[PDB]
PDB file of C-alpha atoms and ligand atoms in Angstrom:
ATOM      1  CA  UNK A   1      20.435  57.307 -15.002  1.00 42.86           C
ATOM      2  CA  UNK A   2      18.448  55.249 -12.861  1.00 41.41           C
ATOM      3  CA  UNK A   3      16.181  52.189 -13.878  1.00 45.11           C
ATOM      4  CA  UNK A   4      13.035  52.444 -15.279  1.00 40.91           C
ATOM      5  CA  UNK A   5      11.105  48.388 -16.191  1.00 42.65           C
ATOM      6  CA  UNK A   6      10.813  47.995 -19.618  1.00 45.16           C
ATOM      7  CA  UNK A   7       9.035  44.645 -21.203  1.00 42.82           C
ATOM      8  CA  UNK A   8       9.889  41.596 -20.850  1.00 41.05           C
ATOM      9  CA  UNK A   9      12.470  42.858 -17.483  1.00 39.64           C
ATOM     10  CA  UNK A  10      12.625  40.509 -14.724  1.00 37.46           C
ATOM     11  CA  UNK A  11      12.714  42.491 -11.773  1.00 37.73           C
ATOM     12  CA  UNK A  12      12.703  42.237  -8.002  1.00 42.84           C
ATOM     13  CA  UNK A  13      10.584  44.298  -5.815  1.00 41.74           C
ATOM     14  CA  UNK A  14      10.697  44.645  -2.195  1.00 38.65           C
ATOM     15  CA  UNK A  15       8.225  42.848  -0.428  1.00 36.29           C
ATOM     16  CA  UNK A  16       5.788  45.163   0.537  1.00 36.21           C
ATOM     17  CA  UNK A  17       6.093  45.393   4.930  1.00 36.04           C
ATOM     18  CA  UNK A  18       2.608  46.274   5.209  1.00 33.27           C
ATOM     19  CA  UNK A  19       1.300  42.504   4.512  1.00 31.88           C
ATOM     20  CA  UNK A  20       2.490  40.444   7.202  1.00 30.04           C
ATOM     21  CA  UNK A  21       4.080  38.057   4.937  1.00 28.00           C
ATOM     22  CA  UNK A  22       6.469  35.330   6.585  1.00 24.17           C
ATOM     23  CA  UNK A  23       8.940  35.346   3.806  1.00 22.67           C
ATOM     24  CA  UNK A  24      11.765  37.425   3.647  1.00 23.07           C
ATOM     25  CA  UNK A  25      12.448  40.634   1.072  1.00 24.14           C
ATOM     26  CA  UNK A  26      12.593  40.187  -2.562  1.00 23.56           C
ATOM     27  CA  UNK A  27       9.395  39.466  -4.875  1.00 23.93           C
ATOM     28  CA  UNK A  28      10.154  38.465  -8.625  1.00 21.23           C
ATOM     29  CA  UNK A  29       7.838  39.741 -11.696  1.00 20.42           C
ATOM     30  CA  UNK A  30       7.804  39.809 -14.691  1.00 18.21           C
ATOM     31  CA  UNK A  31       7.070  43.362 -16.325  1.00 17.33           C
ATOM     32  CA  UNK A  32       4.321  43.362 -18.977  1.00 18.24           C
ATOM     33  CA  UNK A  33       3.773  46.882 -20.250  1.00 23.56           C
ATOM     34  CA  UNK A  34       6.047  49.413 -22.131  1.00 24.17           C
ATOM     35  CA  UNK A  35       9.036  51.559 -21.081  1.00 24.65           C
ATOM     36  CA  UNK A  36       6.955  54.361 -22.494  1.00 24.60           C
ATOM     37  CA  UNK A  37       4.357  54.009 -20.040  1.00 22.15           C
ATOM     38  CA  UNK A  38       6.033  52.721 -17.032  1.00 20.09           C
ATOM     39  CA  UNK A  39       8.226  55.880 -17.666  1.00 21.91           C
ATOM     40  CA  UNK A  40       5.584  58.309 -17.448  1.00 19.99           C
ATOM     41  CA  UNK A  41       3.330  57.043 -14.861  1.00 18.24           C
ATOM     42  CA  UNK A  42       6.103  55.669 -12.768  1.00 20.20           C
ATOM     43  CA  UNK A  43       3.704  52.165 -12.429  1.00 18.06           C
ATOM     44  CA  UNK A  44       3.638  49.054 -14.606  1.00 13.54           C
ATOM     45  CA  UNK A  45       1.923  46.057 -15.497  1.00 12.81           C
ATOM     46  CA  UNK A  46       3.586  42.422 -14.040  1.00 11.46           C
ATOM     47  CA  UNK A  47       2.826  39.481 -12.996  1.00  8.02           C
ATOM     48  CA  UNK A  48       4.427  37.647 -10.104  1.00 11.70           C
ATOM     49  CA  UNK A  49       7.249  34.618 -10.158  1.00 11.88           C
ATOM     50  CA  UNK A  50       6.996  31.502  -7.431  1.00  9.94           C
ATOM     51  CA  UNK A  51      10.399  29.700  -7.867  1.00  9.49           C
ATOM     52  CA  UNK A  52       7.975  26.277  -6.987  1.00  8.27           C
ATOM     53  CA  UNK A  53       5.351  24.621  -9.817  1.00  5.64           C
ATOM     54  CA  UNK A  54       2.478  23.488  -8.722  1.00  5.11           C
ATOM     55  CA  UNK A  55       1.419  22.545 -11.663  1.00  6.92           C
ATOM     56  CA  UNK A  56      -1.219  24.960 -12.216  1.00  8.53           C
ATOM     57  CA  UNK A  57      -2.541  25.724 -16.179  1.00  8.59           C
ATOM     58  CA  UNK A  58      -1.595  30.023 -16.076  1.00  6.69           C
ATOM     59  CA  UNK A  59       2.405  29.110 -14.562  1.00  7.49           C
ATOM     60  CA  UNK A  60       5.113  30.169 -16.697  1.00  4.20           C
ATOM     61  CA  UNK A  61       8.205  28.370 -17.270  1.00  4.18           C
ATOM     62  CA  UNK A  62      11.270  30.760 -16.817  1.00  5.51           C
ATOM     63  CA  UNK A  63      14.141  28.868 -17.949  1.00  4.04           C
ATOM     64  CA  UNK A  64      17.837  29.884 -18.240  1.00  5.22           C
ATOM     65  CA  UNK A  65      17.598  32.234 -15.097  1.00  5.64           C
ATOM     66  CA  UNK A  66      19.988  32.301 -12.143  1.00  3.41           C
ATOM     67  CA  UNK A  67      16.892  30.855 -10.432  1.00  5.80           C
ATOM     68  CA  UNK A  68      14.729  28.138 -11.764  1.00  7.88           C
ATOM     69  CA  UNK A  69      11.053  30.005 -11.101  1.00  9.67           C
ATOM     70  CA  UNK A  70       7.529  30.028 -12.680  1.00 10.56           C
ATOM     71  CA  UNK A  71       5.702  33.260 -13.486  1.00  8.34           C
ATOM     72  CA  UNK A  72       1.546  33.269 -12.692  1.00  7.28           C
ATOM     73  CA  UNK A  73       0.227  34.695 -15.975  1.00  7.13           C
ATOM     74  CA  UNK A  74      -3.061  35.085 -14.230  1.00  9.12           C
ATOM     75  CA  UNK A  75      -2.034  37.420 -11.381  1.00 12.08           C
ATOM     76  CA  UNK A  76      -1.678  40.266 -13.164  1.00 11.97           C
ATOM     77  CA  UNK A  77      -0.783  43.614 -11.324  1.00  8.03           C
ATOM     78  CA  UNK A  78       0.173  46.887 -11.192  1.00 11.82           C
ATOM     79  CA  UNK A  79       2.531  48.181  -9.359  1.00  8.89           C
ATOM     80  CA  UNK A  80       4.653  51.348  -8.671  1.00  6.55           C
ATOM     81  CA  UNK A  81       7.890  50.323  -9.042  1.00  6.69           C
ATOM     82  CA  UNK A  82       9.622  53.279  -7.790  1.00  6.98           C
ATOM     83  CA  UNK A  83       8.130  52.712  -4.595  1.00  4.99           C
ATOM     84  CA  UNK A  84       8.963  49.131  -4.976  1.00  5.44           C
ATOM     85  CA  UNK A  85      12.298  49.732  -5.224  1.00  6.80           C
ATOM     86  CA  UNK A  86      12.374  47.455  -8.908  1.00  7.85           C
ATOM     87  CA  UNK A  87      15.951  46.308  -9.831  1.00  9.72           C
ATOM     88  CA  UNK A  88      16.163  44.601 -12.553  1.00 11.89           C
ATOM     89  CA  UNK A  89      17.633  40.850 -12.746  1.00 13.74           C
ATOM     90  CA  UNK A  90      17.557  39.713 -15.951  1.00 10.00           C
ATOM     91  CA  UNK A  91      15.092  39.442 -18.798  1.00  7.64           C
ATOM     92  CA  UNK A  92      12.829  36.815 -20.161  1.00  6.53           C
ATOM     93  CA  UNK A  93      12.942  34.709 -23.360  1.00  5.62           C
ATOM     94  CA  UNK A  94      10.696  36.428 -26.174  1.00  7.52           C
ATOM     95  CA  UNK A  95       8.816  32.831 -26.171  1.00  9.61           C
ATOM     96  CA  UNK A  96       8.266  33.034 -21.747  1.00  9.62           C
ATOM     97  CA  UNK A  97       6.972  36.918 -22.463  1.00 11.26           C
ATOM     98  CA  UNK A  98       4.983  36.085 -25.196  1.00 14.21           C
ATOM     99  CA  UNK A  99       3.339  32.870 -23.408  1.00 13.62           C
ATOM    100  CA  UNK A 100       2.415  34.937 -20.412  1.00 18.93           C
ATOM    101  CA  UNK A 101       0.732  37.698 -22.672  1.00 19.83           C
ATOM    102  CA  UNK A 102      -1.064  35.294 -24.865  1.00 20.65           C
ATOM    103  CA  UNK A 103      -2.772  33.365 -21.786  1.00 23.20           C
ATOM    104  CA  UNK A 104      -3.348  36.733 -20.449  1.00 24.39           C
ATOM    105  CA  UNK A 105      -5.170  37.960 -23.181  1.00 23.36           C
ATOM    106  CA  UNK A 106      -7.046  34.657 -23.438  1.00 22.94           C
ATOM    107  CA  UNK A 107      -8.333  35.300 -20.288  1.00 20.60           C
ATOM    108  CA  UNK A 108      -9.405  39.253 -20.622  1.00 21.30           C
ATOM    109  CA  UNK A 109      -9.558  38.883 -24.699  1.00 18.08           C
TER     110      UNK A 109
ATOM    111  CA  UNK B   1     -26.449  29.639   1.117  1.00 17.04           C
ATOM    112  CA  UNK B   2     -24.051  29.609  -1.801  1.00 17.94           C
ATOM    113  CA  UNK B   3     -21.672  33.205  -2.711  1.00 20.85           C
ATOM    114  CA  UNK B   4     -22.021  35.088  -5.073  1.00 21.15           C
ATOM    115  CA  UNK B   5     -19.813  34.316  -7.937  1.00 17.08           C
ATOM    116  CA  UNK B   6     -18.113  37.181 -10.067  1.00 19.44           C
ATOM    117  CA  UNK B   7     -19.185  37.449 -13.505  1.00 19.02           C
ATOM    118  CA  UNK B   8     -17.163  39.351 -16.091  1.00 20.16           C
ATOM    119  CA  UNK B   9     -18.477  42.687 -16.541  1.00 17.81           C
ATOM    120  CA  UNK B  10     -20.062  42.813 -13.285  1.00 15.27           C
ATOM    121  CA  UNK B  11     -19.375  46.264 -10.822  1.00 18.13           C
ATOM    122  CA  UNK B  12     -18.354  44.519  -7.488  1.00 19.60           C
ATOM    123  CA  UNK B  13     -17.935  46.170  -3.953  1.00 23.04           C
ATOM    124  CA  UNK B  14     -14.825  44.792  -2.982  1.00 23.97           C
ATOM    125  CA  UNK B  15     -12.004  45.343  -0.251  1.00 20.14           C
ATOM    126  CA  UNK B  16      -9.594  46.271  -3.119  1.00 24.65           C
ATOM    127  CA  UNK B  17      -6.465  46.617  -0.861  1.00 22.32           C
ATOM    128  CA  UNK B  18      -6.792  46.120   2.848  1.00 23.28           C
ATOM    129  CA  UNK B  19      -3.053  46.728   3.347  1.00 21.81           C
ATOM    130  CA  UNK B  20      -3.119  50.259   2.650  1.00 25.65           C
ATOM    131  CA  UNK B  21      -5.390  53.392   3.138  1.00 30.75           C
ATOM    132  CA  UNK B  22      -8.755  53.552   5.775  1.00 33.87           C
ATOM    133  CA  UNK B  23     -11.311  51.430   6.986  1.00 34.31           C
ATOM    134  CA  UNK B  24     -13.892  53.668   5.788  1.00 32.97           C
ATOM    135  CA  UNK B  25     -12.845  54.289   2.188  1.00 33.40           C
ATOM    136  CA  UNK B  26     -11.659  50.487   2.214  1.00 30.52           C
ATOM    137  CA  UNK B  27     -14.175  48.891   0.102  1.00 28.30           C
ATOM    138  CA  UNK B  28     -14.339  50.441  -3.419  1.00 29.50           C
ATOM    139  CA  UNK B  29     -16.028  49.483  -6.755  1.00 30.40           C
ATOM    140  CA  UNK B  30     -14.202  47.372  -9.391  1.00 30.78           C
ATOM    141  CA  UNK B  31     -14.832  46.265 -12.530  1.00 30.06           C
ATOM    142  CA  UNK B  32     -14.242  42.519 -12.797  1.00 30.88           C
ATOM    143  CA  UNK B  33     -12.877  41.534 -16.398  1.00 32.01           C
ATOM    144  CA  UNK B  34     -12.254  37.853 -16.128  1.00 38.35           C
ATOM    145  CA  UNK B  35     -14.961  34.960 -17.315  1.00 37.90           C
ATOM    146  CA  UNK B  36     -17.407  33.073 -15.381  1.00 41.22           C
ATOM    147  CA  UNK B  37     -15.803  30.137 -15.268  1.00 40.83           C
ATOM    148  CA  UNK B  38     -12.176  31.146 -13.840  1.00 41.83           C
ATOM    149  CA  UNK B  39     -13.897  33.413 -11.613  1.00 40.40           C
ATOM    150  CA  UNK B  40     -15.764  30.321 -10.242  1.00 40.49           C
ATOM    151  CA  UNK B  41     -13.005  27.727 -10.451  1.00 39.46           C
ATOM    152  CA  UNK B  42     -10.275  29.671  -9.098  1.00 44.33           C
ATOM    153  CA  UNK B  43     -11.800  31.912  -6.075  1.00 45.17           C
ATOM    154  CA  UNK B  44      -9.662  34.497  -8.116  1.00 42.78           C
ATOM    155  CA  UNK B  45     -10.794  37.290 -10.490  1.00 43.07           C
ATOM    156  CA  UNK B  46      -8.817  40.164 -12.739  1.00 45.95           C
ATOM    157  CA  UNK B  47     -10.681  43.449 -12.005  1.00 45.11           C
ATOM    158  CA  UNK B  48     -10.453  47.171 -12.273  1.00 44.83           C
ATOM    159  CA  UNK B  49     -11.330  49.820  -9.181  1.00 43.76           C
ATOM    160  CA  UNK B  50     -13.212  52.482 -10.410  1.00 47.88           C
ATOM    161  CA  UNK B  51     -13.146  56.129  -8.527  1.00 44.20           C
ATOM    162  CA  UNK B  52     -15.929  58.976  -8.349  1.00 41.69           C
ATOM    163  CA  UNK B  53     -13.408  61.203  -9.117  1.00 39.89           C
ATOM    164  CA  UNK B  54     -12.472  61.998 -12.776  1.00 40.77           C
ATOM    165  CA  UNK B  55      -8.902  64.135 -13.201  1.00 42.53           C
ATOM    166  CA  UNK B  56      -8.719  63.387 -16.854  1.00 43.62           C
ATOM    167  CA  UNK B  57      -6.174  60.465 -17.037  1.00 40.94           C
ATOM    168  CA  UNK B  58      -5.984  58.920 -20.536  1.00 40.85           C
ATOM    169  CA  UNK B  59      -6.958  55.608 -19.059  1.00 40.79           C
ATOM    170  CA  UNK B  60     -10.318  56.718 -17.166  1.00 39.21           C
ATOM    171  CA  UNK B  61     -13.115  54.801 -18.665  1.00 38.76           C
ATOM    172  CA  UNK B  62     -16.718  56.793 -17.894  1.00 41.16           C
ATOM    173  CA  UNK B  63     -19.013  54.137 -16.403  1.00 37.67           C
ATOM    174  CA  UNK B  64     -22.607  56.202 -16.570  1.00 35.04           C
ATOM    175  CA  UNK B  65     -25.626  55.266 -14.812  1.00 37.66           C
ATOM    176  CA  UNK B  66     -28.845  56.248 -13.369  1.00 39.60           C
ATOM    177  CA  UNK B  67     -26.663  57.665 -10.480  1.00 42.15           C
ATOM    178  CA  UNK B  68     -23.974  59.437 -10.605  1.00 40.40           C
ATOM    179  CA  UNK B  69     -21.194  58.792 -13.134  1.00 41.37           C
ATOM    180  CA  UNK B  70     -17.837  57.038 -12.316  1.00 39.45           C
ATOM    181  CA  UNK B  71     -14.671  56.157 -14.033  1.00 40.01           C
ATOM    182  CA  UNK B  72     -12.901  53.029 -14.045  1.00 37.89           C
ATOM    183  CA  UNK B  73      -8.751  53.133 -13.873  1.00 37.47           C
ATOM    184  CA  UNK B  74      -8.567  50.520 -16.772  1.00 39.45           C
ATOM    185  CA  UNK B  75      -4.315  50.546 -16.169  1.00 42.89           C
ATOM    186  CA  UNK B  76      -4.940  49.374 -12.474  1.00 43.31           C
ATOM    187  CA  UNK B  77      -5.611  45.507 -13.002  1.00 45.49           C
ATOM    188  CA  UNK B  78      -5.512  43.560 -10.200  1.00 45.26           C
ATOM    189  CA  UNK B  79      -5.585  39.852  -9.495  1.00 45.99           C
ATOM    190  CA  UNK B  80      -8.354  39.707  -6.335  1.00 45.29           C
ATOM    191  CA  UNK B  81      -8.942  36.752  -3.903  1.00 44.93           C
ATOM    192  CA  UNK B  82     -12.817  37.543  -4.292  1.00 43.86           C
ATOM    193  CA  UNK B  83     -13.859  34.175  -2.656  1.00 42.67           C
ATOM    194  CA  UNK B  84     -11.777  34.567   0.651  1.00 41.53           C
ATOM    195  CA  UNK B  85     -11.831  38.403   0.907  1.00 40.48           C
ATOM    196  CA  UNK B  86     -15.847  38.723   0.049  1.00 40.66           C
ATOM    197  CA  UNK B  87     -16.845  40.299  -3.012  1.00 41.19           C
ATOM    198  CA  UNK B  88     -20.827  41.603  -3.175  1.00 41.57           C
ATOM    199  CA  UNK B  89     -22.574  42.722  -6.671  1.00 40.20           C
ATOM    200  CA  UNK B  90     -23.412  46.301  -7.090  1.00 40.67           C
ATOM    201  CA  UNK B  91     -24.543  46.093 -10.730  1.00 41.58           C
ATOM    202  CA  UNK B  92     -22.977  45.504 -14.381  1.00 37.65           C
ATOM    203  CA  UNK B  93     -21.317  47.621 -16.688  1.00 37.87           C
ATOM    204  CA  UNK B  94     -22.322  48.605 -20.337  1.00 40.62           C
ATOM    205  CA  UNK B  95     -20.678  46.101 -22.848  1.00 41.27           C
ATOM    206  CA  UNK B  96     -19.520  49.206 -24.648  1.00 42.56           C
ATOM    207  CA  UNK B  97     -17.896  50.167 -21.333  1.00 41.55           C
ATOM    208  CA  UNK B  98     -16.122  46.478 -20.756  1.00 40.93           C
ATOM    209  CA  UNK B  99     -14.932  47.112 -24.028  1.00 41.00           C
ATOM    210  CA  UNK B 100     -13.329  50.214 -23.848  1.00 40.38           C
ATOM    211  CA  UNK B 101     -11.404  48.802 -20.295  1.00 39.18           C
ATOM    212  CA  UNK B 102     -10.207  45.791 -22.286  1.00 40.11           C
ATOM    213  CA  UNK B 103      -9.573  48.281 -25.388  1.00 36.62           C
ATOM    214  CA  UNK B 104      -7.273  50.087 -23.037  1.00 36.02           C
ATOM    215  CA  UNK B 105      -5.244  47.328 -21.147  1.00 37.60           C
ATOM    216  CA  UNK B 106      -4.913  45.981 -24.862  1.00 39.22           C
ATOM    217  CA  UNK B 107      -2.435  49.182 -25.840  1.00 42.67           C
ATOM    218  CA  UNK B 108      -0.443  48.193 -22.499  1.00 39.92           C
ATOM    219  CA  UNK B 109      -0.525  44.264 -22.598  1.00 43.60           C
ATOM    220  CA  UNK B 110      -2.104  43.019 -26.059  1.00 40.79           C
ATOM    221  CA  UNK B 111      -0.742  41.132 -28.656  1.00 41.50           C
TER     222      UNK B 111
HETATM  223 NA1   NA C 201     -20.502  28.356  -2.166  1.00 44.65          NA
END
């Protein structure tokens, strides 16, 4: 039984040690697309959490989390999460996923 | 000199991901499906890569030209930093062919 993101998840990924980022382990997303799918091609659709605002129009509010964070609706990615080593955290509020999906859509339509 | 600007629907020759794979199959064709003005404002644009080969994958959409027919991975979106990585314009798709990407991210992401 081991995890496989599902909608609406907040996971963790590794940070990935090929980037040369300064910043320690541990990237928070948000997971966009279904179990279904992230099940069968062991990737998924998320976008990225920044625990600082900057007050930018596609942030995300995720409230009620250990962490107080904000997800960037516009940075959309896919990942494979096995690879990522995904855990999952918590989940989101229907009303955070749903945000981040509509201003996604009004973006792509 | 100003730089070329993504526009949505456009086929771009991009470094799609510098972190991984080889210099010489670094830069690859993508599909950008975000509008104008984000693209502009932001330095930022949501776009597809596209591949010459075709395996059959439910989310291949055929991109078909005067030369030699592609397929774009419509599941693989990807936020890109087009304005500090350098993004160059190989052509534009169909708008039957945007709309079959978007179609297809729509069953993963829409509503
Ligand atoms: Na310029």
């Amino acid at each position: 039984s081991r995890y496989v993101p599902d909608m609406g998840d907040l996971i963790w990924v590794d940070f990935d040690p090929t980037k040369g980022s300064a910043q320690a382990g541990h990237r928070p997303a948000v997971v966009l697309s279904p179990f279904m799918y992230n099940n069968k091609t062991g990737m998924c659709l998320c976008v990225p959490c920044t625990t600082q605002s900057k007050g930018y129009p596609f942030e995300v509010v995720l409230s009620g989390q250990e962490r107080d964070g904000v997800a960037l609706a516009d940075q959309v990615k896919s990942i494979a999460w096995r690879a990522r080593g995904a855990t999952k955290k918590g989940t989101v509020a229907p009303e955070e996923l749903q945000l981040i999906k509509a201003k996604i859509n009004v973006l792509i339509g």
